Structure 1
Amino acid sequence: MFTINAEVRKEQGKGASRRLRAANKFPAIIYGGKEAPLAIELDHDKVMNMQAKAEFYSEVLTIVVDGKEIKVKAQDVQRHPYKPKLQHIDFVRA
């Protein structure tokens, strides 16, 4: 059971995303069901060490944001084109 911790994104966009990535974080989003898509940031190192194993992506994961566990499954992931890095992640509610 992987448990991710995350914060809600105040500012979204191109520059904001770039800034996040510079600061060892990276954006991600949750979507699914009746509830509205939730944008969050993630600490990059934690989640990279995570996504290394394959079970990360098959199994259900728990995201903690504002002290609330959301169970999601990793749907899609943007990687940096020529680095072992994550640009962005799509999570779907589960």
Structure 2
Amino acid sequence: MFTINAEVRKEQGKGASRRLRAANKFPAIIYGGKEAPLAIELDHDKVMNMQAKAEFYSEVLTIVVDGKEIKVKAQDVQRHPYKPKLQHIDFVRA
């Protein structure tokens, strides 16, 4: 079980996402089902080491957002053009 600790995003858009990335954190979205999409911020270091394991993309992962725990699956990753970093992740509510 992959446990990803996250936070709901207070800001949205280009400016915020860049500032986030600078601060060694990266934006990600949770969509799927009746429930409205959830804007989350993740730690760049912790998630990056996770995704290194192939199992990250097959298994169902729990994304802890302010107490609540959301079971999701890795949908689409947006990678850095040339650096071994992550720009954004799509999480489909499983």
| TM-score normalized with structure 2 length | 0.99
Q: CA deviation at 1:82?
A: 0.2
2:61 counterpart residue number: 61
Distance in 2 between residues matched to 1:32 and 1:50, nearest whole Å: 22
**SS state of the match for residue 16, structure 1?**
helix
- What stretches of structure 1 of length at least 5 have no aligned partner? none
Q: CA deviation at 1:6?
A: 0.3
Distance in 2 between residues matched to 1:57 and 1:44, nearest whole Å: 17
Q: CA deviation at 1:92?
A: 0.3
Q: CA deviation at 1:84?
A: 0.4
Q: CA RMSD in A?
A: 0.3
Q: CA deviation at 1:17?
A: 0.2
| Structure 1 residues 33-74: Cα deviation after superposition (integer angstroms, max 9, x where no partner) | 000000000000000000001000100000000101100000
| TM-score normalized with structure 1 length | 0.99
Distance in 1 between residues matched to 2:83 and 2:54, nearest whole Å: 19
Distance in 2 between residues matched to 1:36 and 1:66, nearest whole Å: 16
Identity %: 100
Distance in 1 between residues matched to 2:69 and 2:8, nearest whole Å: 13
| Matched residue count | 94
2:9 counterpart residue number: 9
Q: CA deviation at 1:27?
A: 0.2
